[PDB]
Design a binder for this molecule. Structure first.
Ligand SMILES: CCCCCCCCCC(=O)O
Length: 204
């Protein structure tokens, strides 16, 4: 119902099914009514839309994520990889990695024992690992505001089990299952960017 597809032997990720799966992730930022972590949500959603626009023009040409990078490298020459869907996916993977590290941290029981019902330590770890190195001073401040406003852990978990009779432990089990194919997929995308020399280090 929103699991990602398993990783193929050949590690070639199909573009259409990938976009379909990750487009179910922005709504989770809305599970508490007022959206949470809005700058992270907005970037994920905006980058999905950009990649989908390129894919939809020629699904066979852009059948896999690797095809996008191959095709755009040829099309755009020296401007690549700072172009098109290659650039949108370079940023998308960092928002997807934020979600991965955040959810894994919560599932692993990582917390500040003085604030066991907050998720600030999990969100900070995820931000540091995924996004911080690529954000200038102004953008970092925009993220800290989203940090101070983070929901309570119990409210965040209640809201993921949208109106179901499921315990916090049962909810965490479901997130752990989701994390298996999701983490593998993000790791393969990162490895592709490094292999293809598509990764850039500029800050926004
Ligand atoms: C129930 C397994 C799927 C969990 C997906 C949750 C995505 C959370 C996005 C966020 O960090 O706000």
């Amino acid at each position: 119902e929103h699991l990602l597809r398993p990783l193929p032997a050949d590690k070639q990720i199909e573009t259409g099914p990938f976009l379909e799966a990750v487009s179910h992730l922005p709504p989770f930022f809305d599970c508490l009514g007022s959206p949470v972590f809005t700058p992270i949500k907005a970037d994920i959603s905006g980058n999905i839309t950009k990649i989908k626009a390129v894919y939809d023009t020629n699904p066979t040409k852009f059948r896999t994520l690797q095809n996008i990078l191959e095709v755009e490298k040829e099309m755009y020459g020296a401007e690549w990889p700072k172009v098109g869907a290659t650039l949108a996916l370079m940023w998308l993977k960092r928002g997807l990695r934020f979600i991965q590290v955040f959810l894994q941290s919560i599932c692993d029981g990582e917390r500040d024992e003085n604030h066991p019902n907050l998720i600030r330590v999990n969100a900070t770890k995820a931000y540091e690992m995924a996004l911080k190195k690529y954000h200038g001073w102004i953008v970092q401040k925009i993220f800290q505001a989203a940090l101070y406003a983070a929901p309570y852990k119990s409210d965040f978990l209640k809201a993921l089990s949208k109106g179901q009779n499921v315990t916090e432990e049962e909810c965490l089990e479901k997130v752990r299952l989701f994390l298996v194919n999701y983490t593998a997929t993000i790791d393969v995308i990162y490895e592709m960017y490094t292999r293809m020399n598509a990764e850039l280090n500029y800050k926004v």
